[PDB]
Nucleic acid binder design. Structure first.
Ligand code: MG
Ligand code: MG
Ligand code: MG
Ligand code: MG
Ligand code: MG
Lengths: 126, 56, 313
RNA sequence: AACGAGACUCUGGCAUGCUAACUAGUUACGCGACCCCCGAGCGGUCGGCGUCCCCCAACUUCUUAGAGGGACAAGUGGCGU
């Protein structure tokens, strides 16, 4: 048997999805026609294997993103999550409080407010 | 392949050339190499679309 | 509340069911085309034991059967196939009496004239073709036409002005003027390729759909986008009701029905829970066709079944 | 990035779908002829046997050989970071 697609079958199927993503549905016999229209595959046997990897990749891409294919419609949802996140309109705030040996680090840099104190358990970690 | 006679025996020559896929031409052959899939891609797809309806 | 309930299932096929046809002259007969190179004429014993039995199996084809439509009288069937041919059967014996040849590539759909004098088809060839019932090709619209697969064309049961509607993959709708075969008007929008288009019995609408997920309405003499209904995932095939002001759509796994007065869902027809371990658990619905009654619809799925749904109050 | 592997070329397996055939046929009857009742019948008619003779009959299942179609780990369930 074998059935380990060669790198010339796993590179067509990767370019095709990038260029034509909105045609390539999820069944095999329609993809076998779209692929025959868009590119020039000089054989029937090769055309079918390319169109058969396209379907695998399509089923996988209807989940999370795959690391060889950069499609337009799935960039923008990452671009969003980098532009901002649903969590906060405030900063994670300046109103935060700390403990000793830093009050004296500031006493030589001149701060005077919004802090706390607790002298830690009296020997190094255990 | 060819022969060459020199005053010390014979030499032989072998030459092989690979023709450069002349599409439809006469400089090389048609029908590119089998493992040569090639993808074509057009442009001008502007999606801006509200449902307008032209009339002829 | 007019609400649909699962009446029964039909079974016996061997591939996807892709089209269903019905005709008022015979209420017990139903025609279903499939993905196994054959079409089936059923015999509806409405007993709940099995709502039907396969009466006859028409054969002769080399590939998938994309479209099927019965004559106006209920004695001829016309079917169009991915092998690039149309066959005009004889629903008494079988015996395709006439066949049509010229499309270079897969015929995706066909339609019949209500006076049974003109035949139209569209194909992966990117061309509309009009024929006599003797199988001579009467006209080919290669110019003026879509630039991609002509996925579905329909005849308008209009009073007098003969016009045919077309929907393709270049995400356009095109209305035609018969007797001159020039494009009347276009209809633009529809981000995504188109799967179907269908007109109301009187003819004022074309409920079209496709990859957009939405069903758009259009006008047949005014020429405006009336409104959009938001459908969800994808729209396989659309159909208007015979006796009411309803539109039914086959979304991916389930059916949706809308009342056009106030543009609202009547219901979603689902199917039952299964323990399937996967994405796309549901077999998808492919094409659905109302009865002549208006009291039942059949819909064909991608698991070789045809399911029957009936209205109740 | 290149070669080898693979792709490729021939062949075997499937089409009652297409193209079309006295240098391949089949079915029919136009036949007719032979033979037996071998069965209704009588012996013809109803039938049975024919690589017996025909058709300017109908067709392509069998034969031949061309164009396309078909299979992709594609569907479903497990094991896989
Ligand atoms: Mg082989
Ligand atoms: Mg053979
Ligand atoms: Mg003989
Ligand atoms: Mg072949
Ligand atoms: Mg799996």
């Amino acid at each position: 048997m074998g059935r380990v697609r060669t790198k010339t079958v796993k590179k067509a199927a990767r370019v095709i999805i990038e260029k034509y993503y909105t045609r390539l549905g999820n069944d095999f016999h329609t993809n076998k026609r779209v692929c025959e229209e868009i590119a020039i595959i000089p054989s029937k046997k090769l055309r079918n294997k390319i169109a058969g990897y396209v379907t695998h990749l399509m089923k996988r891409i209807q989940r999370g993103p795959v690391r060889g294919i950069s499609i337009k419609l799935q960039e923008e949802e990452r671009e969003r999550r980098d532009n901002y996140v649903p969590e906060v309109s405030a900063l994670d705030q300046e109103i935060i409080e700390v403990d000793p040996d830093t009050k004296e680090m500031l006493k030589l840099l001149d701060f005077g407010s919004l802090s706390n104190l607790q002298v830690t358990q009296p020997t190094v970690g255990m | 392949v060819r022969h060459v006679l020199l005053r010390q025996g014979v030499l032989g020559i072998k030459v092989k050339i690979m023709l450069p896929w002349d599409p439809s031409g006469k400089i090389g052959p048609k029908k590119p190499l089998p493992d040569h899939v090639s993808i074509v891609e057009p442009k001008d797809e502007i999606l801006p679309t509200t449902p307008i309806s032209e009339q002829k | 509340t007019e609400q649909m309930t699962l009446r029964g299932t039909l079974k016996g096929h061997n591939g996807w069911v892709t089209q269903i046809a019905t005709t008022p002259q015979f209420p017990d007969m139903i025609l279903s085309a499939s993905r196994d190179k054959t079409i089936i004429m059923w015999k509806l014993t409405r007993d709940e034991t099995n709502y039907g039995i396969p009466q006859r199996a028409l054969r002769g084809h080399s590939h998938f059967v994309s479209d099927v439509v019965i004559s106006s009288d209920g004695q001829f069937a016309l079917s169009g196939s991915w092998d690039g041919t149309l066959r005009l059967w004889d629903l008494t014996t079988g015996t395709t009496t006439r066949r049509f040849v010229g499309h270079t590539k897969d015929v995706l759909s066909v339609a019949f004239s209500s006076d049974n004098r003109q035949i139209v088809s569209g194909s992966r060839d990117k061309t509309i073709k009009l024929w006599n019932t003797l199988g001579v090709c009467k006209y080919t619209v290669q110019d003026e036409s879509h630039s991609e697969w002509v996925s579905c064309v329909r005849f308008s049961p209009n009073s007098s002005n003969p016009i045919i509607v077309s929907c393709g993959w270049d995400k356009l709708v095109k209305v035609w003027n018969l007797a001159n075969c020039k494009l009347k008007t276009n209809h633009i929008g529809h981000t995504g390729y188109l799967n179907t288009v269908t007109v109301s019995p009187d003819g004022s609408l074309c409920a079209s759909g496709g990859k957009d997920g939405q069903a758009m309405l259009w006008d047949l003499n005014e020429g405006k986008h009336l409104y959009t209904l938001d459908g969800g995932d994808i729209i396989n095939a659309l159909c208007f009701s015979p006796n009411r002001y309803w539109l039914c759509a086959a979304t991916g796994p389930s059916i949706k029905i809308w009342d056009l007065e106030g543009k609202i869902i009547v219901d979603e027809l689902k199917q039952e829970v299964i323990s399937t371990s996967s994405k796309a658990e549901p077999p998808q619905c492919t094409s659905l066709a109302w009865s002549a009654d208006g009291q039942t619809l059949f819909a064909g799925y991608t698991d070789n079944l045809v399911r029957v749904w009936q209205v109740t109050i």
